[PDB]
Amino acid sequence: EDPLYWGIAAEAMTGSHLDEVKKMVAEYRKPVVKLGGETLTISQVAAISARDGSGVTVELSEAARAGVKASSDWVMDSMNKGTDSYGVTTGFGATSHRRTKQGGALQKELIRFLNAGIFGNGSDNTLPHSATRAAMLVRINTLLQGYSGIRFEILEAITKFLNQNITPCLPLRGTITDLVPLSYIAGLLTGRPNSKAVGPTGVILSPEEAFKLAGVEGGFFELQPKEGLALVNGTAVGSGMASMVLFEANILAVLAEVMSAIFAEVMQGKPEFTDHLTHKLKHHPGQIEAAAIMEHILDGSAYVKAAQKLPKQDRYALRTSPQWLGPQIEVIRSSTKMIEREINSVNDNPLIDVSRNKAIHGGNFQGTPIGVSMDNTRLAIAAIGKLMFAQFSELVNDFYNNGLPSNLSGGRNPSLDYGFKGAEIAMASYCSELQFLANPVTNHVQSAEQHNQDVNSLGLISSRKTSEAVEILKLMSTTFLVGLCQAIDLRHLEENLKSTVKNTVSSVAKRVLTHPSRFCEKDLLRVVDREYIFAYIDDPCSATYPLMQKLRQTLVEHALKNGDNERNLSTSIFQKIATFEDELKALLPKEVESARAALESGNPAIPNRIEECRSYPLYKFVRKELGTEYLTGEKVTSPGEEFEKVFIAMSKGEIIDPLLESLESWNGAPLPIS
C-alpha cells in the first residue's frame, strides 16, 4: 500500500495549520516530555529548550531499555570476538584504514580530537544554552531506538543534566552537520579537563561540580567501544535548533495572518478580498486558510458592521495578503514535518542490527533535511517580513491609510509629534537585513575532511541564520502590532471628535441659519461626514484647513442657487456666512478640546469599537495587560519603551493566548459564499 512511506508523510499534512498550531501550544505546556525515540515534536524540543523555570521534565521510556541493552551488549561481544568494526577497532573518516585493539582508548581519543572548537572569552562564540539543551534532548531520542550500542546509563545521565538545568558549554561553530559540538557533551560525561558547564543561574561548573549538582552518581563515564561515536555522530544540534526556530515560525505565521486582518480593520479595507470564491478558485490550501482566518476576524469586526449600516479595491499589501502568506505557511508546515522526522530519526553510523547480527554502514548523519528545510523556511520568513514591511508602510502613510494621521501621530500638535517615523525607518532596516538573511546556506558546501565528506549539509549553520531571521521577524511584529494598536485608538479618537464636530456644526447651523438657508444644514453635515477629521482637527477653524473652506463653499453654492431671494439681505445666504463662521469659530475649538479631554479621561461619548471586535484580545493584551501606552508628542515616552513591553512579552510566549483567543470561535471553515 505505502512501501516508501510517502502516504504516511502525506497524512501529517491534513487538517488546518491553525489546529496544528493549537496542538503545538498544548504540547508545549505539558509538564512531562516522555521520550521513546519516536514521538518527539518540535513543541517538546522547544519546551525542554527553555531555561525559564517552566518545570518541564524529561523522562525516558522504559520500553526502550531492552533494545538499547541488546545493541550495547552486541558491540561488547563483538569486541571480545576480535572482529573488525568501523569506529570500534578502526580509525575514523578518511583515516579508517588505521586499526587498533584498544577500544576504550579509541573512544577517549575520538572525544579529544573532536574537541576542536573555540570559545574565546565571553559568550559570542558559545552555542546558546537553550540550543544545547535542545541538542541533548534530540541526541537521547536518537540513541533510545536501540540501534546505537551505548549504555542506557549514559542517556539517564544526560536526562539528569536536563532535569537539573546543568548544561555543558558547546562551541557555536565548528560543524558542517555535528561531531565537534556534540563532543563537548561527551566531554562533560567523561569529565574532560577542559569541559565546562553552566548551572541554572549561570555559574560555570567543573565536570565534578556538574555531576554533583545533577545528582549523577558513580563518577565520570569511561566510554566503551562505539559509545563516543554514538554520542557525536548525529544531527542533534542542527535539528535541535531547527525545532526551536520552527515552533516560533509557526506561531508567527498565525500572528501574521491575524495582524493582516487587524490591518484591514484599521485601514477600512474591503473585506471582499477574503471572499472564499477568490481563494477556492486557486486551490492553494495555505491561501485558503489565510483568507478564511482573516475573513473570520473581519466578519466579527465592529468596524465592518458599523460601515455596513451606513476606490473599489485596496493596494496589494492588503488585498493580496492571503495569496502572499499562503505559500509561506505551506513551506513552514512542510519544513516542520521534515524536521519532526529528523528529530525522530536514527541519525547515527554505523547502525547495529542485532536482528541480523551485523552493523549497517550508511549516511544517516547527513543532515540535508535540516539544511534544506531551514534554507526554505528562512526565505519564507523573509517573505512574511516583506509583506509586514509593506503593510506597516501603508498604515503610516496618510496617502494610503484612509484618513489616519501621517506617522500615526498621537498628540494634539502634529508639528511636535512625528509618531512612528523613527519606527518606520527601523522597519526598513529590519526588512532589508531580513532579505539579506534570505540567501541560502546550503549552496556553500566545501569538500571536507580530506574529501571524505565531499557533500555535507551545513544544517546547523542554516538553523542559526533562520533563528536570526525569526528574531528580526519578532522585532517587526512587535513594531507592527504596537502600530496597529495606536491606529485602533486613533479610529476611536476619530469617531468621537467627528461626532463633536457634526453636533457643533448642526447646532450653529440651526441657530444662525434659522430664512431659506435652513436647506443647507443637510449639506453642511455631509461636509463633516465625508471630510477626514485628521486633515483639520488640530486646528478645526483654521481658514486654510478643509473644514472651514468646504463649509463656506457649501454656503456659497446654496446662495448661488438661492435666486432672487439672494437679492434681499433679509433672505441672503451669503449675508449669513460671516455670522456662521464667527459663531463656529467661537464654539467649535472648545467643544473639540472638551470631547478630546473627556476621551483621555475614559469618558468618551462613543465607546472604543475594538471592544466588540474578534481582534479585541490582542489589543486588550497589548494596551491593557501589558500597559503599552498610546504614543504622543505631548508626553516624554518613546515608541521603543513601548515596543520593549510587547517584545519581551512576545519572547516569553505571552502573545500566544490572546492570538489564539481572537480565533477561538472559528469553526475552521470559510464562510458560505454570499
Ligand X SMILES: C=C(c1ccccc1)[C@@H](N)P(=O)(O)O
Distance in Å from the first CA to the final CA of the chain: 42
Secondary structure (H, E, C), 86-154: CCCCECCHHHCCCECCCHHHHHHHHHHHHCCCCCCCCCCCECCHHHHHHHHHHHHHHHCCCCCCCCHHH
**What whole-number distance in Å separates Cα of residue 88 and Cα of residue 110?**
11
State which of positions 181-220 bind ligand X (CB under 6 A): none
Query: Which CB sits closer to ligand X, 349 or 486?
Result: 349
Of 179, 390, 555, 599, the one binding ligand X by CB under 6 A: 179
Does residue 447 interact with a copy of itself by CB under 8 A? Answer: yes
The least distance separating ligand X from the CB of residue 241, rounded to whole angstroms, comes to 20
Does residue 96 interact with a copy of itself by CB under 8 A? Answer: no
State which of positions 55-94 bind ligand X (CB under 6 A): 92-93
Does residue 439 interact with a copy of itself by CB under 8 A? Answer: yes
Give exposure, 3-14, as e/b (b: 16+ Cβ within 10 Å).
eeeeeeeeeeee
Phi/psi at 440 (nearest 5 deg)?
-75, 155
Q: Which of 91, 138, 116 lies closest to 187, judged by CA? A: 116
**What whole-number distance in Å separates Cα of residue 204 and Cα of residue 62?**
33
Beta bridge partners of 359: 352
Evaluate whether 182 touches 190 at the Cβ level (below 8 Å): no
**What whole-number distance in Å separates Cα of residue 189 and Cα of residue 223?**
9
Residues 6 or more apart whose CB falls under 8 angstroms from that of 116 comprise: 174, 180
Evaluate whether 505 touches 584 at the Cβ level (below 8 Å): yes
Number of residues that bind a copy of itself (CB under 8 A): 18
> Beta strands 197-198 and 204-205: pairing type?
antiparallel
* 175 to 194: interface string for a copy of itself, x by CB under 8 A: --------------------
- The one catalytic residue in 28, 86, 545, 630 is 86
State which of positions 345-404 bind ligand X (CB under 6 A): 349, 365
C-alpha grid cell for residue 165?
A: 538545568
Q: Which of 58, 44, 275 lies closest to 155, judged by CA? A: 58
Number of residues that bind ligand X (CB under 6 A): 7
Query: Which CB sits closer to a copy of itself, 560 or 586?
Result: 560
Q: Tell whether 313 is in a known binding site.
A: yes
Partner that binds at residue 637, options ligand X, a copy of itself, none, CB closer than 5 to 8 Å by kind: none
The least distance separating a copy of itself from the CB of residue 171, rounded to whole angstroms, comes to 24
Query: Which CB sits closer to ligand X, 233 or 409?
Result: 233
State which of positions 444-463 bind ligand X (CB under 6 A): 452
**What whole-number distance in Å separates Cα of residue 65 and Cα of residue 72?**
11
Of 63, 428, 556, 605, the one binding a copy of itself by CB under 8 A: 556
Binding segment for a copy of itself among 90-98, 233-241, 246-254, 551-559 (CB under 8 A)? 551-559
- Return the biggest CA–CA distance within the chain: 125
Q: Tell whether 145 is in a known binding site.
A: no
Query: Which CB sits closer to a copy of itself, 418 or 574?
Result: 574
Partner that binds at residue 444, options a copy of itself, ligand X, none, CB closer than 5 to 8 Å by kind: a copy of itself
Does residue 562 interact with ligand X by CB under 6 A? Answer: no
Query: Which CB sits closer to ligand X, 92 or 152?
Result: 92
Q: Would residue 86 show up in a list of annotated catalytic residues for this protein?
A: yes
Phi/psi at 176 (nearest 5 deg)?
-105, 10
Does residue 147 interact with ligand X by CB under 6 A? Answer: no
Q: Tell whether 23 is in a known binding site.
A: no
Partner that binds at residue 365, options ligand X, a copy of itself, none, CB closer than 5 to 8 Å by kind: ligand X
State which of positions 476-535 bind a copy of itself (CB under 8 A): none
Does residue 309 interact with a copy of itself by CB under 8 A? Answer: no
**What whole-number distance in Å separates Cα of residue 127 and Cα of residue 133?**
10
Can you say which residues are annotated as belonging to the binding site? 233, 313, 319, 349, 421, 449, 452
Catalytic residues: 86
Residues that bind a copy of itself (CB under 8 A): 399, 439, 443-444, 446-447, 451, 549, 552-553, 556, 559-560, 567, 569, 574, 577-578
Residues that bind ligand X (CB under 6 A): 92-93, 179, 233, 349, 365, 452
